[PDB]
Amino acid sequence: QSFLWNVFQRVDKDRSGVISDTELQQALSNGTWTPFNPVTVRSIISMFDRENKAGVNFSEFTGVWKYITDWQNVFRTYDRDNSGMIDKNELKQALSGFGYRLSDQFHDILIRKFDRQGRGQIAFDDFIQGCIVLQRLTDIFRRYDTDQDGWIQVSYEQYLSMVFSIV
């Protein structure tokens, strides 16, 4: 815990015992010399903050640290030329490793939706956000696919509630 405590003290710049969105963003590198995607930061804090305080305490931060390190290790695996972005094939391999079953064309769609750099590849911070969204959307789809055939049938109002649950 000593290592993690030392890291926590450095990130918690106001020394309040709660790391904010701004503090976490400032402590994170996306490997492209631009500020770490604040939407990704918001997602991560929101997932690990158990008390609706717009931040993480030390115990929650240990979760954040492991989460971010785990994502780093995935991205490091697949960014084969260490360019700071992964291409459609590298992304394909990454997501297939997770068990996703997606067509070649979908990988282009995902890159376009989340790549803030406008290069047709995806940087680390944007990759986490895309994956978070993909996981949430896939969890929701799994709930409605009652016979596991890769299709859902939903009414207008089921659909509205489905979209509202994203969130």
Residues contributing to the annotated binding site for Ca(2+): 12, 14, 16, 18, 23, 79, 81, 83, 85, 90
Cα–Cα distance, 162 to 167 (Å, whole number): 9
- Residues annotated within a binding site: 12, 14, 16, 18, 23, 79, 81, 83, 85, 90, 145, 147, 149, 151
Q: Which does 147 bind (CB under 5 to 8 A by kind): its own copies, Na ion, none?
A: Na ion
Cα–Cα distance, 87 to 83 (Å, whole number): 10
Q: CA geometry: angle at 43 spanning 40 and 49, to 5°?
A: 135
Q: Which of 62, 102, 115, 117 binds its own copies (CB under 8 A)?
A: 102
Q: Is 63 exposed, middle or buried, given 0-12, 13-18 or 19+ CB atoms closer than 10 A?
A: middle
| β-strand partners of 85 | 123
Supply the minimum distance, in Å, between the C-beta of residue 167 and its own copies.
9
CB closer to its own copies out of 63 and 116: 116
Residue 70 sits in the site that holds Na ion (CB under 5 A) = no
